[PDB]
Amino acid sequence: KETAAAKFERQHMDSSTSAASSSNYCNQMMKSRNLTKDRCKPVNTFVHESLADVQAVCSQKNVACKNGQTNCYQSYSTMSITDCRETGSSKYPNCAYKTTQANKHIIVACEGNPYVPVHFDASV
Template sequence: MGTLLTMQPLPLLLLLLQPFPFQFLMLRKYLDLSPSQEEAFQDYLAELYTTGPTKPPTKESFQKDVIIDFERPLSDFNYCCGEILMKNVHTRLHCRKEHFFLGVEYKELQKLCKQRFVACKNGVKRCHRSLKLIEGVYCNLTDGVMMPDCRYQSFYKKGYVLITCRWQDDIRQMIPAHVNDILETHYQQ
């Protein structure tokens, strides 16, 4: 008399395999994608299911994930939940513990990369600080682990932005890589 493992190894193996990537492969043949869209889709799938380090941020990914327009009020308490889902902000489908959205033009942030270093919120002098006040929203994860179950608390902030920058080889420019914090100012006008 054998166990289930020795009697039915193939069905058990198929149960253990994750069907999610296979659904994407099946879906692809029904989509009418241009070659550039197909390539972008392949890159996205590779990024999701690779086991190595995540790709460093690019100019395009930073703009997509961080820069916002003012179509919705920034003080909306549900701002982060909706915007993170709409912009598809995650790290390999895992929720980010915190995230910032900024209401500023990308070129303004890119200029900050030429400023001298200041201390980040952890004390390490690797950040660049904005010279002007910038409006934004701070998102703090309150519930969930994987997309789309991420729930965030939204905090409207107006202050000086701290960012880190990195070199992007293909465009040969320093680009904003990460928003470290928004330092709020508390003064009367």
């Protein structure tokens, strides 16, 4: 099945663009990554950086995860992110997102060997 590592790239990485360039980024991106296959994913964040730079977060600042888990990491640096929030007009299968671009610190959950990002926790 797809790995938690691969899932994360699919759901959260967007190295092809430096920022969202239009209000439709989210609608376009949530669809083509398959996040709207079974239901409207209510919220999702895309990171507009190198895979390598996101993977490095696993050896940055250790912080507790919002759920109390202790395998979270916070980026020393701010990163180009795209926030996607479902809209009041959202109706499955026509999922609708509000697109919000920001530069923030990203907090991820890391697991395995190689020890990499498996979960996007929050942006701070």
